[PDB]
Amino acid sequence: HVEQTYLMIKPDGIQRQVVGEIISRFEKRGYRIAAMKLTIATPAILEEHYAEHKGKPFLPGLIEKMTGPVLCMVFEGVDVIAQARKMMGSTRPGEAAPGTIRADFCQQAGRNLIHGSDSAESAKREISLWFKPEEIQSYKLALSDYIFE
Amino acid sequence: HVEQTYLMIKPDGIQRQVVGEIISRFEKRGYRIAAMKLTIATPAILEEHYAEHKGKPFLPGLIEKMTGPVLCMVFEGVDVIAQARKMMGSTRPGEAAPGTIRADFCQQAGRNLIHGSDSAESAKREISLWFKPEEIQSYKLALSDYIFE
Amino acid sequence: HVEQTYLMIKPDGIQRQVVGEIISRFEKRGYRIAAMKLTIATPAILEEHYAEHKGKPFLPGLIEKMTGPVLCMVFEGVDVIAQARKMMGSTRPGEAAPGTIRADFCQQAGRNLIHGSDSAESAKREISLWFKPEEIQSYKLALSDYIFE
Ligand SMILES: Nc1ncnc2c1ncn2[C@@H]1O[C@H](COP(=O)(O)O)[C@@H](O)[C@H]1O
Ligand SMILES: Nc1ncnc2c1ncn2[C@@H]1O[C@H](COP(=O)(O)O)[C@@H](O)[C@H]1O
Numbered sequence: 003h004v005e006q007t008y009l010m011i012k013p014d015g016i017q018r019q020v021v022g023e024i025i026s027r028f029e030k031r032g033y034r035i036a037a038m039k040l041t042i043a044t045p046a047i048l049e050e051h052y053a054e055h056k057g058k059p060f061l062p063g064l065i066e067k068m069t070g071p072v073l074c075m076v077f078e079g080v081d082v083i084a085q086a087r088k089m090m091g092s093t094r095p096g097e098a099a100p101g102t103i104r105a106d107f108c109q110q111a112g113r114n115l116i117h118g119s120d121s122a123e124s125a126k127r128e129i130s131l132w133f134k135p136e137e138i139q140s141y142k143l144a145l146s147d148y149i150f151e
Numbered sequence: 152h153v154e155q156t157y158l159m160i161k162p163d164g165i166q167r168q169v170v171g172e173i174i175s176r177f178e179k180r181g182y183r184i185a186a187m188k189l190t191i192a193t194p195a196i197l198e199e200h201y202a203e204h205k206g207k208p209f210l211p212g213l214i215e216k217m218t219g220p221v222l223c224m225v226f227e228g229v230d231v232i233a234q235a236r237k238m239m240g241s242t243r244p245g246e247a248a249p250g251t252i253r254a255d256f257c258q259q260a261g262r263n264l265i266h267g268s269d270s271a272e273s274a275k276r277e278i279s280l281w282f283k284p285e286e287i288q289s290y291k292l293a294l295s296d297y298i299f300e
Numbered sequence: 301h302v303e304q305t306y307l308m309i310k311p312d313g314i315q316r317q318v319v320g321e322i323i324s325r326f327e328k329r330g331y332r333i334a335a336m337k338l339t340i341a342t343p344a345i346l347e348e349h350y351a352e353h354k355g356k357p358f359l360p361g362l363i364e365k366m367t368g369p370v371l372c373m374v375f376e377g378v379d380v381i382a383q384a385r386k387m388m389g390s391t392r393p394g395e396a397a398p399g400t401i402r403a404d405f406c407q408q409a410g411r412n413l414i415h416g417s418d419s420a421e422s423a424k425r426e427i428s429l430w431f432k433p434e435e436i437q438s439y440k441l442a443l444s445d446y447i448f449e
């Protein structure tokens with residue numbers, strides 16, 4: 003039983019030129035790239051991405067920081083929603099565990115490199131927001147017998 | 152002072168072609184390769200290796216997954232039995248700590264890349280099962296003065 | 301918002317030829333190299349470095365192990381004193397978390413690769429002991445807008 007999560011490299015990941023290193027961390031566990039697209043995020047889409055925070059005082063500055071190039075991604079694997087969050091580490095890099103993306107690359111929450119869905123419901127919503135169904139690619143990894151039980 | 156542990160790269164580690172990366176993680180700590188042999192594990196030797204699980208429902212499928220090429224290894228170092236277990240991480244990759252082999256490479260317990268002895272008693276038994284005493288090589292690391300206090 | 305910490309690669313780090321790997325771990329978080337100097341540590345400077353331990357029975361052996369080439373470093377970043385300690389890991393490599401320098405490279409406390417300041421007061425004192433003010437370089441990282449919130 004696999005699932006799919008939405009992972010997005012934020013503008014700091016693009017500008018620091020660590021896109022490949024980020025992708026390699028997820029590929030290393032045998033997670034499958036199901037979708038990938040470079041875009042420039044707009045306020046219109048970011049308002050919906052961050053809909054839970056409508057009306058909050060930090061939302062304008064958060065949208066501003068995110069208005070830039072991003073890499074939209076979908077990865078598939080067992081428990082991948084929760085596992086991707088564990089791999090990213092805590093929101094605040096200073097609190098994240100060594101070995102996580104945020105602890106290894108970052109200093110502050112406002113520049114923490116990557117977003118990932120926080121739940122099954124959020125993953126479905128975010129994938130549908132950033133990708134049309136025709137952009138989601140279904141194929142089987144050739145090493146499946148050595149990745150899955 | 153130093154101990155020796157039995158570590159075995161499972162068929163998934165061979166087939167995913169991460170043998171060198173695994174070895175490098177142990178070399179990086181100054182652990183000494185005391186023995187190393189590629190073989191193909193067979194049901195008869197695997198039944199001995201997993202003797203504690205004789206008759207349990209999972210054992211046939213476990214033996215099937217393990218019937219394939221494996222890299223038998225003995226590493227030497229301070230506290231290396233417990234330390235190698237810590238470096239492998241939890242049996243279930245989803246529970247293993249960031250930075251461990253199983254967290255960094257794997258998804259499920261049935262394909263968790265590597266075996267390591269769980270105790271001094273098990274290390275003695277496993278080394279005797281998979282190696283002849285004379286495949287264990289005695290030599291000293293030239294960097295010993297900078298590895299050991 | 302940023303502070304500076306004193307980090308010193310010990311003779312084992314020099315002799316095992318992992319200096320670049322150590323530096324890369326700190327650069328990876330966008331920490332700025334403010335000072336760097338190769339020297340050979342001598343007993344008289346080490347007595348001042350370890351002044352808090354005057355009279356303790358372990359001090360002579362400690363000074364002996366530390367007599368050798370060292371790389372003196374100052375890194376700057378948000379919370380970098382505490383964060384560098386977290387990245388080094390526990391004094392004893394066998395207790396340190398996977399993903400930390402000491403867990404990834406070392407076996408014993410007496411050969412644990414690196415020193416880092418333990419507090420704001422120790423950072424100020426150690427920086428002044430090992431570096432003259434003219435050796436501390438002030439410049440801005442070009443990627444600052446993507447490192448700092
Ligand atoms: N500037 C901020 N202030 C408060 N909370 C934030 C801020 N930025 C991000 N968050 C929280 O962290 C979560 C993940 O944000 P993101 O990684 O940008 O998707 C959001 O859903 C917020 O709950
Ligand atoms: N399929 C399984 N079912 C139950 N326990 C298992 C299974 N695979 C591994 N284990 C446990 O994990 C330990 C180490 O297994 P291995 O790494 O395959 O030698 C065994 O000694 C078992 O206790």
Ligand SMILES: Nc1ncnc2c1ncn2[C@@H]1O[C@H](COP(=O)(O)O)[C@@H](O)[C@H]1O
Pocket residue numbers: 300390391392409410411
């Ligand atoms: N170079 C060393 N050799 C042996 N033991 C040490 C050394 N440095 C620190 N320790 C001890 O290791 C233990 C753990 O250190 P810490 O985690 O820093 O409290 C303490 O009890 C220290 O006294």
Ligand SMILES: Nc1ncnc2c1ncn2[C@@H]1O[C@H](COP(=O)(O)O)[C@@H](O)[C@H]1O
Pocket residue numbers: 358359361362391414415416
């Ligand atoms: N041989 C030792 N015995 C006990 N404690 C030690 C020893 N070496 C270092 N320590 C402790 O660990 C701290 C960090 O040591 P260092 O990394 O050498 O600066 C020292 O300030 C001591 O508190």
